[PDB]
Amino acid sequence: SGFRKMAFPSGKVEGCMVQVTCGTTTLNGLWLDDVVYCPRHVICTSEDMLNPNYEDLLIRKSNHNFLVQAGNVQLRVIGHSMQNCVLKLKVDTANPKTPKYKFVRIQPGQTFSVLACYNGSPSGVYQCAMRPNFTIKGSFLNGSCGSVGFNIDYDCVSFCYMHHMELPTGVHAGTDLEGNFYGPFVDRQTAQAAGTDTTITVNVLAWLYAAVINGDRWFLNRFTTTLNDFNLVAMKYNYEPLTQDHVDILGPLSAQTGIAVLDMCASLKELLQNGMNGRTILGSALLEDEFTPFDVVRQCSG
Amino acid sequence: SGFRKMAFPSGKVEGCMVQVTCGTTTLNGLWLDDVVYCPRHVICTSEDMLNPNYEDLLIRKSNHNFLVQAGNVQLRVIGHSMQNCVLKLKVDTANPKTPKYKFVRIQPGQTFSVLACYNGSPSGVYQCAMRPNFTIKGSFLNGSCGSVGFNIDYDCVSFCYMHHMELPTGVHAGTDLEGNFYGPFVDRQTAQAAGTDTTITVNVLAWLYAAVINGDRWFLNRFTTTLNDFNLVAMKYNYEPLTQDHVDILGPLSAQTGIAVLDMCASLKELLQNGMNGRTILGSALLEDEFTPFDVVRQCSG
Ligand SMILES: *[C@H](O)[C@H](C[C@@H]1CCNC1=O)NC(=O)[C@H](CC(C)C)NC(=O)OCc1cc(F)c(F)cc1F
Ligand SMILES: *[C@H](O)[C@H](C[C@@H]1CCNC1=O)NC(=O)[C@H](CC(C)C)NC(=O)OCc1cc(F)c(F)cc1F
């Protein structure tokens, strides 16, 4: 009973967070086996940030320019390299707490847990969706770079995000763990604009199924719609098109509730056209689009 | 930048969760030093649940009736006792991962992180407030009992909640770690009603300060109010009275934003009387009351 935005338990990742210092710049790194991963802008200084030439900056560095601190213990850096926008620091000690892990590059609309960290020390955990415009709506202050996002599946941690920057609109941008930015962003100290965002339709439908599973039924109707006709209304309200692949993904939730997917689409259409009229769904006065179908199944039951 | 509902990192608690089995009943326990804490209704059966006599049920049990599983390892139960609504199981092994910890009984309006668990295995983490009617709005399924709520302060875990039951309205009730229920509830398989709930005024004000710190200023006004006059309007909208102690607690946030507390009260009064007119605050169309002043300061900065 109840439905909450829920993060994965963070213990397996907490044991991987370290502090990386280069000069007067300190941020977080991810320590897996004998490698530490961190954002390459740790090697920048005050005037570098505007438009840094990272290959030049890195060639001017040596191993002893990097300070890695794991709790109170200093780790010796014995090699360094740059891969896209991430720095990889080889250290003399393999992390004894390295979980089973993978690196994954996620698609827009997928969610993950963020372990916000400062100075190598975890601060809090929360759930984020990769927006269609490749930003996330996080909570990050100075010193948070190198915090990572992840999913957990049977004690295997899939890392999918490393934090690098904030945009002027207060949203956030970063890379996969191979250092490739999500979206068009670059790691420079400049105001960068994201594309216009859209609402993740398949997630809104998943969340309406969660509401029914939890006993919220007031928005259902007897009407039905075609997929093409639903997507015409979706365009008008800046919702992503719903594909047949999305319909199939909602299959299990549709089977558990007995509500056909295109039936739930007819409910969403009426909610988009008439509003909620002062009612709420799962406690929300706005339609929620940061729960995937997987998130709903993981948390709901019978 | 950004403001998110954020849980504490859960690693220190994950290493304390075990499975407790009595007969065909399985739930979660908390393993600290050589004691396992769990809800006493683990010793109930099908017909016991309606109105169990727990002292009778426990006198009919012996140590070997309790199965404790820590991961794959079985722990030997070498003693047992009941304290209020919690069972305490002495085991032959002290938990090597026992954090520094305290047991605390919290006041309504305070928040904590919940580590939802099933079969001794952590499932997810989320933040909850103890409501004025001593329920929490959680997400708990069959098998979740014994999941705990906690706060963390400089690597000391303060445990404040253990989960025992759901109410017919879909909210949740439980005990402190000494086994005393929050609120009037009892651990019987019966429909129990909570008192009428009210909104946590000091938390709503804290969250309005978070919005200003984050650049949301549209709800401010030039007007001001007295505390007595604010509390007359609070009663009309089912808000808790604001005390001078609450005003003092909001001191730091007021000093950082330059907005006097009674000035922010005048904003809240106008929001209560006129609504938001289709605008949002920190992404919310409803006023949020599950962030304490401490939560805001912990997460916000300059
Ligand atoms: C790394 O810790 C930090 C995270 C930021 C800091 C505040 N909240 C965050 O998420 N990342 C940065 O500070 C990056 C460093 C660059 C070298 C990549 N810069 C950044 O986020 O700048 C944002 C920015 C910059 C300019 F110039 C603007 F005009 C607006 C703006 F939002
Ligand atoms: C323990 O795991 C479980 C947690 C519940 C199960 C579903 N969601 C939860 O949070 N606790 C219980 O099942 C307790 C056991 C009692 C012996 C304390 N019962 C319970 O929650 O019942 C709720 C209930 C009971 C009756 F009879 C009703 F009519 C309504 C109702 F909500």
Do the beta carbons of residue B81 and residue B104 sit within 8 Å?
no
Bridge-based pairing state of the strands A35-39 and A86-91: antiparallel
Q: Residue B168: CB within 6 Å of ligand 2?
A: yes
Q: Which residues contact B125 (CB under 8 A, 6 or more apart)?
A: A6, A7, A8, A9, A10, A125, B7, B8, B10, B113, B114, B115, B116
- What is the Cα–Cα distance from B213 to A266, expressed in whole angstroms? 40
Give exposure, A226-245, as e/b (b: 16+ Cβ within 10 Å).
eeeebbebbeeeebbebeee
Q: Is A275 exposed, middle or buried (0-12, 13-18, 19+ CB in 10 A)?
A: exposed
Looking at the domain that runs over B201-299, which CATH code has it been given? 1.10.1840.10
C-alpha separations of B224 from A208, B227, B228, B261, B264 in Å: 41, 10, 12, 9, 8
Q: Residue B40: CB within 6 Å of ligand 2?
A: no
Token duo for residue B100 = 């520094």
Closest to B2 (Cβ–Cβ): which among A5, A9, A172? A172
- What is the Cα–Cα distance from A139 to B82, expressed in whole angstroms? 43
Which ligand is nearest to the Cα of residue B116, counting in written order?
A: 2
Which ligand is nearest to the Cα of residue A173, counting in written order?
A: 1
Per the document, the length of chain A is 302
- What is the Cα–Cα distance from A250 to A268, expressed in whole angstroms? 14
In this structure, the residue with its CA closest to atom 22 of ligand 1 is: A189
Q: Which helix (H) or strand (E) holds B66?
A: strand B66-70
From B16, B117, B145, B265, active-site residue = B145
Q: Which helix (H) or strand (E) holds B298?
A: helix B293-299
Interface with chain B: mutation pick from A8, A139, A284, A294, highest number of B CBs within 10 Å: A139
- What is the Cα–Cα distance from B281 to B219, expressed in whole angstroms? 9
Nearest Cα to A167, choosing from A147, A150, A183, A146? A183
Give exposure, B217-230, as e/b (b: 16+ Cβ within 10 Å).
eebbeeeebeeeeb
Nearest Cα to B174, choosing from B124, B140, B126? B140
Please, after which residues is chain B broken with C–N above 2.5 Å?
none
Q: Which helix (H) or strand (E) holds B174?
A: strand B172-175
Closest to A11 (Cβ–Cβ): which among B10, B124, B137? B10
What is the number of alpha carbons within 13 Å of residue B98 lying toward its C-beta?
14
Are A116 and B6 within 8 A, CB to CB?
Answer: yes
In chain B, residues with a C-beta closer than 8 Å to the C-beta of A285 are 285-286
- What is the Cα–Cα distance from A68 to A25, expressed in whole angstroms? 12
- What is the Cα–Cα distance from A65 to A22, expressed in whole angstroms? 6
Do the beta carbons of residue A150 and residue A37 sit within 8 Å?
no
Nearest Cα to B140, choosing from B179, B170, B104? B170
User: Taking chain B, what is the end-to-end CA distance rounded to the nearest angstrom?
Assistant: 10
- What is the Cα–Cα distance from A39 to A188, expressed in whole angstroms? 12
Closest to A4 (Cβ–Cβ): which among B139, B280, B298? B139
- What is the Cα–Cα distance from A92 to B265, expressed in whole angstroms? 57
Identify the experimental approach: X-ray
Bridge-based pairing state of the strands B66-70 and B17-22: antiparallel
- What is the Cα–Cα distance from B222 to A98, expressed in whole angstroms? 55
Looking at the domain that runs over B11-91, which CATH code has it been given? 2.40.10.10
- For residue B73, report the phi and psi dihedrals to the nearest 5 degrees: -85, 130
- Amino acid identity of residue B281, one-letter, is I
- For residue B231, report the phi and psi dihedrals to the nearest 5 degrees: -70, -25
From A41, A163, A164, A172, active-site residue = A41
Identify residues of A whose CB sits under 8 angstroms from chain B CBs: 1-12, 14-15, 115-116, 122-126, 137-142, 166, 170-172, 214-215, 280, 283-286, 298-299, 301
Distance from CA of A252 to the nearest CA of B (A): 19
Q: Which residues contact B105 (CB under 8 A, 6 or more apart)?
A: B160, B176, B178, B180
Q: Is B160 exposed, middle or buried (0-12, 13-18, 19+ CB in 10 A)?
A: buried
In this structure, the residue with its CA closest to atom 27 of ligand 2 is: B190
- What is the Cα–Cα distance from B65 to B24, expressed in whole angstroms? 11
Token duo for residue B53 = 């006599």
B300 belongs to the catalytic site: no
Bridge-based pairing state of the strands B35-39 and B66-70: unpaired
Q: Tell me, letter by letter, the H, E, C secondary structure of chain A.
A: CCCCCCECCCHHHHCCEEEEEECCEEEEEEEECCEEEEEHHHHCCCCHHHCCCHHHHHHCCCHHHEEEEECCEEECEEEEEEECCEEEEEECCCCCCCCEEEECCCCCCCEEEEEEEECCEEEEEEEEECCCCCCECCCCCCCCCCCEEEEEECCEEEEEEEEEEECCCCCEEEECCCCCECCCCCCCCCCCCCCCCCECHHHHHHHHHHHHHCCCCCCCCCCCCCHHHHHHHHHHCCECCCCHHHHHHCHHHHHHHCCCHHHHHHHHHHHHHHCCCCCCECCECCCCCCCCHHHHHHHCCC
Angstrom resolution of this structure: 1.8
Are B9 and A6 within 8 A, CB to CB?
Answer: no
Q: Tell me, letter by letter, the H, E, C secondary structure of A250-278.
A: CHHHHHHHCCCHHHHHHHHHHHHHHCCCC
3-state secondary structure of B231: helix
Are A6 and B139 within 8 A, CB to CB?
Answer: yes
- What is the Cα–Cα distance from A138 to A298, expressed in whole angstroms? 22
> Among all residues of chain B, which has the CA nearest to that of A215?
B170
- What is the Cα–Cα distance from B84 to B268, expressed in whole angstroms? 41
Do the beta carbons of residue A67 and residue A20 sit within 8 Å?
yes
- What is the Cα–Cα distance from B44 to B14, expressed in whole angstroms? 26
In this structure, the residue with its CA closest to atom 23 of ligand 2 is: B166
- Amino acid identity of residue A253, one-letter, is L
From B16, B41, B265, B300, active-site residue = B41
Are A9 and B142 within 8 A, CB to CB?
Answer: no
Token duo for residue A166 = 């904030």
Token duo for residue A39 = 């954002």
Give exposure, A90-102, as e/b (b: 16+ Cβ within 10 Å).
bbeeebeebbebe
Dihedral over alpha carbons B34, B32, A148, A92 (to 10 degrees)? -40
3-state secondary structure of B194: coil
- What is the Cα–Cα distance from B125 to A8, expressed in whole angstroms? 6
Helices B261-274 & B201-213 angle (0-180, nearest 10): 100
B145 belongs to the catalytic site: yes
Do the beta carbons of residue B8 and residue A125 sit within 8 Å?
yes
- In this structure, the number of other CB atoms found within 10 A of the CB of residue B168 comes to 11
Are B138 and A2 within 8 A, CB to CB?
Answer: yes
Are A11 and B7 within 8 A, CB to CB?
Answer: no
- In this structure, the number of other CB atoms found within 10 A of the CB of residue B33 comes to 12
Structure-token match 């029914």, residue found: A212
- What is the Cα–Cα distance from A257 to A261, expressed in whole angstroms? 10
Nearest Cα to B174, choosing from B187, B185, B163, B188? B163
